[PDB]
Amino acid sequence: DLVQVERNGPVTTVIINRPQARNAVNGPTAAALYSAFAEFDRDESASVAVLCGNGGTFCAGADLKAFGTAEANAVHRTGPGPMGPSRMMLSKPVIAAVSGYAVAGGLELALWCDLRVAEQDAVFGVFCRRWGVPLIDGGTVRLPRLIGHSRAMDMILTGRAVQADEALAIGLANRVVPNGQARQAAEELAAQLAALPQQCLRSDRLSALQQWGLPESAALDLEFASISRVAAEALEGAGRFAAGAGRH
């Protein structure tokens, strides 16, 4: 209910369903988002996820009305991030379908996604700046890596709104589509990615993510393992198939 999950073949769409609260994420919402993604991550028949929100907006961030209530976000050094899936490194990609606002914790969730499909009138922004709530869902980690330190610092210091056209110009949005269309676009793109050779995509993706800690030589070493992962997977698959030859 707070988070709806819909599946269409190998594409899973995870939907924040608090449109009355502009899809602000409280504790139980973050819990349900973590679950949906934990289940996606281990479901072998799911290849690509889409994250979106109901009711014309993506996510307003942490639910400020729930602060000091029992429905407040969970804030712990370990386990799930306050927004839910924000500390996860999934083994498969997620596409953010961004309508309306991705602000504060909601910007963070959009950044945590691998790609961002934005509607023409979508707005990104560190809106928590005006309220004094810190970025504690990876926004300070991912934003400089995604778009470079200079534009990240602009967004983080000022808390300014970044509209979809500027977001596209600076690499923050990967696509800009018409209003009402982000979900359909993200789901179409997700089905396209799901039709590609999976282990190869997955292994390249994870290497691109994991290299951000590493020095070049160590990063190169980790990237190289991809050839072992892809061959091992392909051969494990043939082996499983051959075990049924002359038997079924």
Of residues 55 through 74, those in contact with a second copy by CB under 8 A are: 64, 67-68, 72-74
Over the window 23 to 42, marking each residue x when it contacts a second copy by CB under 8 A and - when it does not, the resulting string is ----x----------x--xx
Instruction: Give residues 129-168 in contact with a second copy (rule: CB under 8 A).
Output: 129-136, 138-154, 156-159
- 219-243 burial code (b ≥16 CB/10 A, e <16): beeebeebeebbeebeeeeeeeeee
Which lies closer to a second copy via its Cβ, residue 7 or residue 130? 130
Q: Which of helix, strand or coil describes residue 221?
A: helix
For a second copy, the binding residue among 8, 178, 238, 243 (CB under 8 A) is 238
Rg (CA), the chain: 19
Over the window 74 to 103, marking each residue x when it contacts a second copy by CB under 8 A and - when it does not, the resulting string is xxxxxx-x-----xxxxx-x----------
Which lies closer to a second copy via its Cβ, residue 54 or residue 210? 210
Residue 224 structure tokens: 């190289």
Binding status of residue 197 toward a second copy by CB under 8 A: yes
- CA dihedral (214, 220, 222, 227) in degrees, to 10, reads 160
Binding status of residue 224 toward a second copy by CB under 8 A: yes
Task: Name beta bridge partners: 3.
Answer: 16
| Nearest CA among 101, 130, 95 for reference residue 23 | 101
Which lies closer to a second copy via its Cβ, residue 92 or residue 183? 92
